């Protein structure tokens, strides 16, 4: 369940994250866009283990932070787990495209009776983190909508339970 | 992990032994009772039963679902303890893991050990080792971690004890 990603920093000394201490582990709070970290598939809510072949265990946002910047050369080295509190839930349009949940800045709210959602077991409570491939989060509710929207038929979303979600952000 | 059917049979008494409970409009296991059909057919605590005899349970109360499988005439389509996650530490020269824990839930994390080096988190509860470990004294769980490769499964803490 575990893999390192080589960072190389950009011109600027950048890689385009931000960390954050979660239960005395390390995790992904912010990839920036076509960053060195989003170019190596770092992604919110990745558990970062090691940096630079060191620990992160019990390490504050603020250590986690200082390590990165003062990191030496150009590359960095992480090993990641993927995405460990959340999970996938794949679903089906009905014929009238709405698979079946409304949702609420970003957290699910409802599951409607009968949908392809109730069928796959989809949860209240959680964020919606990505649409079949795609990061939602920091998104308007209009925005998510409508990638929503922008059918897909099928439509996998990753979930979060909003607690923890909540902690991360 | 997916989604899986399972096929269960009333025992001699009629009976399952299983316990429900309603989370986040599913419906969870809270309990599975010792060598019932329901521990015979691989369920767990902390599964997730999507459909009873093809009905969803979604927003089920935990009410209903045991009357639907008390008055049942049973398949059970359910998704493995979603709640849950599975990390494996290797014992140290001592034989430690590298972690602390009080009344099942892990409370600290030993530098420098294998439950460091793989990210092992704090108020998590623990859930299994492989046994099954819930309701367990902890130095009965300390006794079965005693007992080189340690794999366990844990739970964030906000959500065992709402299941529990």
């Given at each position: 369940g575990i893999r390192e990603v080589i960072l190389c920093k950009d011109?600027?000394?950048?890689?385009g994250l931000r960390l954050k201490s979660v239960d005395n582990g390390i995790f992904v709070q912010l990839v920036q866009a076509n960053s060195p970290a989003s170019l190596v598939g770092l992604r919110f809510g990745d558990q970062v283990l090691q940096i630079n072949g060191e620990?992160?265990?019990?390490?504050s946002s603020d250590k986690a932070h200082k390590v990165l910047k003062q990191a030496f050369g150009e590359k960095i080295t992480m090993t990641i787990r993927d995405r460990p509190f959340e999970r996938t839930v794949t679903m089906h349009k009905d014929s009238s495209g709405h698979v079946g949940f409304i949702f609420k800045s970003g957290k699910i709210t409802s599951i409607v009776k009968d949908s392809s959602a109730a069928r796959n077991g989809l949860l209240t409570?959680?964020?919606?983190?990505?649409?079949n491939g795609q990061n939602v989060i920091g998104l308007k509710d209009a925005q998510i909508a409508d990638i929503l929207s922008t059918?897909?038929?099928?439509v996998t979303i990753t979930i979060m339970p909003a607690f923890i979600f909540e902690h991360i952000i």
């Open positions: 011109q600027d000394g950048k890689i620990n992160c265990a019990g390490w409570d959680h964020h919606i983190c990505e649409i059918a897909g038929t099928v």
